[PDB]
Amino acid sequence: ANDTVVVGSIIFTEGIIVANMVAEMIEAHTDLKVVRKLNLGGVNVNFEAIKRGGANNGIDIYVEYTGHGLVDILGFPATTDPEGAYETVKKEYKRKWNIVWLKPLGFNNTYTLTVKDELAKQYNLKTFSDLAKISDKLILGATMFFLEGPDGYPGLQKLYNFKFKHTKSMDMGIRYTAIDNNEVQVIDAWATDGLLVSHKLKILEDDKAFFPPYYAAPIIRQDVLDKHPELKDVLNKLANQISLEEMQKLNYKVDGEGQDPAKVAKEFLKEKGLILQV
Numbered sequence: 624a625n626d627t628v629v630v631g632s633i634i635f636t637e638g639i640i641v642a643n644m645v646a647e648m649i650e651a652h653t654d655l656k657v658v659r660k661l662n663l664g665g666v667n668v669n670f671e672a673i674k675r676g677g678a679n680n681g682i683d684i685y686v687e688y689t690g691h692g693l694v695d696i697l698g699f700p701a702t703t704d705p706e707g708a709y710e711t712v713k714k715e716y717k718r719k720w721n722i723v724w725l726k727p728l729g730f731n732n733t734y735t736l737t738v739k740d741e742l743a744k745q746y747n748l749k750t751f752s753d754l755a756k757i758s759d760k761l762i763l764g765a766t767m768f769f770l771e772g773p774d775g776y777p778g779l780q781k782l783y784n785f786k787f788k789h790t791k792s793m794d795m796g797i798r799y800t801a802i803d804n805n806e807v808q809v810i811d812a813w814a815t816d817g818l819l820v821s822h823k824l825k826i827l828e829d830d831k832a833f834f835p836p837y838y839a840a841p842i843i844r845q846d847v848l849d850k851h852p853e854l855k856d857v858l859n860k861l862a863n864q865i866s867l868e869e870m871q872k873l874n875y876k877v878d879g880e881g882q883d884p885a886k887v888a889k890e891f892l893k894e895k896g897l898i899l900q901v
């Protein structure tokens with residue numbers, strides 16, 4: 624029959640790596656072939672694409688983050704434990720959209736606010752509240768996702784009364800260079816970022832708990848599951864298979880060592896026994 628499915632990703636290192644892992648698992652364990660589609664746009668493009676579907680210029684599968692789905696359902700930022708976010712998005716996406724959340728990959732790739740270790744020492748910074756008290760001295764460099772999202776800087780700034788001198792919208796790798804060069808003093812480091820542990824940076828504590836959990840999980844259209852039921856068990860072979868530290872190392876293989884993400888994804892799966900060498 625030569626059935627195919629479309630796995631989507633937006634264009635950032637982690638997104639492409641885990642989208643490739645999903646594609647590799649499908650091709651290794653089923654007779655399906657995978658179209659890998661890269662979407663330009665923000666944190667909602669894949670959601671609209673999966674509502675369209677791989678037959679109608681959209682996608683069938685992608686890896687979403689629980690807290691993003693949660694804040695989208697609620698219409699305002701909230702905090703909850705990982706189970707609260709996951710169970711809520713799973714039930715709501717099943718009822719409202721016939722989209723099935725599969726099991727979490729294992730890591731929480733949350734937004735953070737991060738500063739240079741030297742700045743944190745010179746002002747004894749530990750928490751977001753500490754940082755807010757001096758924010759009028761500082762420049763924030765942040766991803767477009769962070770500066771535009773309701774779960775991003777808008778709500779955070781309201782809750783903590785952040786008063787940064789200004790914000791600079793920056794590509795993902797650019798913001799690490801910018802904080803290194805002191806063009807900015809704070810960035811929205813993401814917890815799994817490959818460059819993070821390699822730049823002498825301090826992740827500050829979200830002491831008022833503004834951010835939701837951001838656990839990555841594959842999600843799939845129900846009608847694709849209906850046509851190809853094996854996909855459920857196949858994709859759940861990834862359940863809890865990627866820790867925060869493992870994801871960081873894969874991201875660094877791409878962003879720091881220059882390996883291509885397809886190779887990084889496939890080699891990780893082979894080394895962990897999740898696919899076999901052909």
Ligand SMILES: C[N+](C)(C)CCO
Nearest residue numbers: 666732733734813837
């Ligand atoms: C994963 N983040 C929450 C850090 C943003 C991208 O969706």
